[PDB]
Amino acid sequence: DPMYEQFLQRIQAVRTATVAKDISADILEARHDYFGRELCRALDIEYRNNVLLDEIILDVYPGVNLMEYNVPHVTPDNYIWTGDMLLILDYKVSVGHDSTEVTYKKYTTLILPVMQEIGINTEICIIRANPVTNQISIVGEQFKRLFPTIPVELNFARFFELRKMLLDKFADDEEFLMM
Numbered sequence: 001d002p003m004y005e006q007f008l009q010r011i012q013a014v015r016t017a018t019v020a021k022d023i024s025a026d027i028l029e030a031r032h033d034y035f036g037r038e039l040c041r042a043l044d045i046e047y048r049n050n051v052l053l054d055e056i057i058l059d060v061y062p063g064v065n066l067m068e069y070n071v072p073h074v075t076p077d078n079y080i081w082t083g084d085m086l087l088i089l090d091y092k093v094s095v096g097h098d099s100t101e102v103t104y105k106k107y108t109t110l111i112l113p114v115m116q117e118i119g120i121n122t123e124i125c126i127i128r129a130n131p132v133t134n135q136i137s138i139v140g141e142q143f144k145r146l147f148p149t150i151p152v153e154l155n156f157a158r159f160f161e162l163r164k165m166l167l168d169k170f171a172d173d174e175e176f177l178m179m
């Protein structure tokens with residue numbers, strides 16, 4: 001478990017609230033990426049993690065003149081180009097809905113206008129795993145139509161253990177409390 005052992009080594013050595021806070025964010029990012037790999041594997045789709053919107057456009061429409069459009073330089077996690085429709089994909093790991101709503105609004109308002117200008121049928125798709133219950137939530141009707149079941153086998157226990165160890169090391173640290 002080289003990813004686990006690297007985190008553990010960092011948790012053993014950390015002494016300051018600011019370095020611990022970076023450890024915490026790093027753990028949350030790695031558990032998010034773990035879900036993305038596992039999800040794409042279960043669905044047997046190409047795994048990507050942050051593709052520049054400009055690059056997505058060139059992949060689906062090679063003859064595009066990028067400079068004739070105002071392309072927001074967002075980096076959604078992944079996409080599916082069926083040949084007829086573009087599914088923009090972002091992974092989430094959270095017990096709650098709020099981060100899904102933030103990214104939904106952002107990618108709806110920033111990606112959909114230019115894609116309609118370009119002429120590319122696009123759907124914004126956000127796939128959330130609850131890290132405690134392993135239940136999967138999907139926004140994106142065409143994604144659900146393409147993938148009615150998702151046979152993932154998720155275990156988030158090790159990410160919770162690492163983060164709990166770090167939070168317990170700093171549970172009497174006022175600074176870290178705030179961060």
Ligand SMILES: COC(=O)/C(O)=C/C(=O)C1(Cc2ccc(Cl)cc2)CCN(Cc2ccccc2F)CC1
Pocket residue numbers: 028029032050075077090091092093103
């Ligand atoms: C869960 O879905 C996302 O949230 C997502 O995939 C976010 C990201 O890709 C970034 C890395 C990250 C991944 C998972 C977690 Cl847990 C935490 C962080 C990298 C891209 N930046 C976008 C950005 C870039 C520059 C300025 C402001 C910004 F918002 C967000 C974090």
Ligand SMILES: [Cl-]
Pocket residue numbers: 013014015016019020
């Ligand atoms: Cl430190």
Ligand SMILES: [Cl-]
Pocket residue numbers: 016
């Ligand atoms: Cl110090």
Ligand SMILES: [Cl-]
Pocket residue numbers: 073074075076
């Ligand atoms: Cl982005």
Ligand SMILES: [Mn+2]
Pocket residue numbers: 049050075076077
């Ligand atoms: Mn991302």
Ligand SMILES: [Mn+2]
Pocket residue numbers: 032077090091092
């Ligand atoms: Mn994401």
